[PDB]
């Protein structure tokens, strides 16, 4: 069951996977792990997550370890600053190169090891 919000459908998984296995599941359903591009979308996502941890489309790109969205939405460092949990991203064990929705708050995101298994959220555009 996909949920609808502002022009996109979202799949909140019932089974946990690593970040990449999650992304492949999304891709098999003509989607991607979700990007987050506004306060209203962040709010929709974290509220729907209901306090459980879900992989989202956050991952590193480039030598400098810049964050990026797997669906290729340009990542806006300034506009996204308010969406991380205070203290994140912290790159623990120098091995946290993927991101999830963790806290039920506008400040929701944590960076975690890509090989950890969590539920996940796919995002699929509706094309009229």
Ligand X SMILES: OC[C@H]1O[C@H](O)[C@@H](O)[C@@H](O)[C@@H]1O
Contact flag: residue 23 with Ca ion (CB under 5 A): no
Q: Closer CB to ligand X, residue 116 or residue 124?
A: 116
Do residues 36 and 107 lie in contact, with contact meaning Cβ atoms separated by under 8 Å? no
Q: Per-residue x/- marks for Ca ion, 75-94, CB under 5 A?
A: -------------x-x-x--
The nearest distance, CB 108 to ligand X, in angstroms, is: 13
- Residue from 33, 111, 120, 123 touching Ca ion (CB under 5 A): that is 111
Please report, as ranges, the residues that interact with ligand X according to CB under 6 A: 88, 90, 92, 96, 110-112
Residue nearest to Ca ion (CB): 111
Where does this chain bind Ca ion (CB under 5 A)? Answer: 88, 90, 92, 96, 110-111
């Amino acid at each position: 069951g996909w949920k609808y919000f502002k022009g996109n459908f979202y799949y909140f998984s019932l089974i946990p996977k690593t970040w990449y296995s999650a992304e492949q599941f999304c891709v098999s359903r003509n989607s991607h792990l979700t990007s987050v591009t506004s306060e209203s979308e962040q709010e929709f996502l974290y509220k729907t997550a209901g306090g459980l941890i879900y992989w989202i489309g956050l991952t590193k790109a480039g030598m400098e370890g810049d964050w990026s969205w797997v669906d290729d939405t340009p990542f806006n460092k300034v506009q996204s600053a308010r969406f991380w949990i205070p203290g994140e991203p912290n790159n623990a064990g120098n091995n946290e190169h993927c991101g999830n929705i963790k806290a039920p708050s506008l400040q929701a995101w944590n960076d975690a090891p890509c090989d950890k298994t969590f539920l996940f959220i796919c995002k699929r555009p509706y094309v009229p």
